[PDB]
């Protein structure tokens, strides 16, 4: 399982993994990039 948050403090996202990168490195399973708000999300083992 996993939970994603909004990593808007990192800067909008251009792809779908670009955000996941910062997420993992931060300590997450991955992340996402919402086009509706161009923000970076990060999934964690939640």
Domains of the chain, with CATH numbers? 1-46 (3.30.30.10)
Helix (H, G, I), strand (E, B) or coil at 19: helix
N- to C-terminal Cα separation, the chain: 6
As to burial, measured by CB atoms within 10 angstroms (0-12 exposed, 13-18 middle, 19+ buried), residue 15 is exposed
Reading phi first (left if > 0) and then psi (alpha if -120 to 50, else beta), residue 29 is in: alpha
User: Which residues are bridge partners to 41 per DSSP?
Assistant: 6, 32
Which helix (H) or strand (E) element contains residue 23?
Answer: helix 17-27
CB 22 within 8 A of CB 42: yes
The experimental method behind these coordinates is NMR
Reading phi first (left if > 0) and then psi (alpha if -120 to 50, else beta), residue 42 is in: beta
CA torsion through residues 12, 19, 42, 2, sign: positive
């Amino acid at each position: 399982r996993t939970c994603m948050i909004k990593k808007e403090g990192w800067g909008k996202c251009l792809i779908d993994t670009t955000c996941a990168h910062s997420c993992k490195n931060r300590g997450y399973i991955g992340g996402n990039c919402k086009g509706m708000t161009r923000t970076c999300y990060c999934l964690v083992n939640c």
